[PDB]
Design a protein around this ligand. Structure first.
Ligand SMILES: NC(=O)[C@H]1CCCN(C(=O)Cc2cccc3nonc23)C1
Ligand SMILES: [Zn+2]
Length: 139
């Protein structure tokens, strides 16, 4: 579990979105596992606007933050689940690091701000859904 709160927005993994998220839907993309809903209270998360390939992510399954090197956002194959059929997930970044289902929603950050959230993982790898291209989250 986990979300990004920037201004009047809440960014969550689309497969973990609530009924309230869908009733206050702004934008969603199955191919990226993202859903953005509107909020009444103000959010203060700063979104990074950069091409950083190093950062720190929160791992709930370990109650620890870990430094990582991660790849550039790309289309990566992801296996089937109770949420999606087998497909290519776009805007996805992989890092060598620990993750387990339950870790989705953990924030990845660089010195510039929020880079994205945990969305996939397995076999010593962790995948992050990038949010840096969503320029409209700030305006
Ligand atoms: N974006 C998707 O299609 C997801 C949907 C939920 C299930 N997915 C996983 O990757 C499970 C998983 C296993 C093992 C470490 C994991 N860390 O985070 N998620 C992990 C795929
Ligand atoms: Zn950065």
């Amino acid at each position: 579990s986990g979300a990004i709160y920037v201004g009047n927005y809440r960014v969550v993994n689309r497969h973990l979105a609530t009924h309230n998220d869908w009733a206050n839907l702004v934008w969603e993309d199955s191919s990226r596992d993202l859903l953005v809903s509107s909020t009444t209270a103000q959010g203060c998360d700063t979104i990074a606007r950069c091409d950083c390939q190093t950062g720190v992510y929160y791992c709930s399954s370990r109650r620890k933050h870990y430094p990582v090197s991660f790849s550039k956002p790309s289309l990566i194959f992801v296996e089937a689940s109770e949420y999606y059929p087998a497909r290519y997930q776009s805007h996805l970044m992989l890092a060598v690091g620990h993750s387990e289902p339950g870790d989705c929603g953990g924030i990845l950050r660089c010195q510039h701000g929020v880079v994205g959230i945990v969305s996939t993982g397995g076999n010593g790898l962790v995948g992050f859904a990038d949010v840096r291209d969503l320029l409209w989250l700030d305006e």
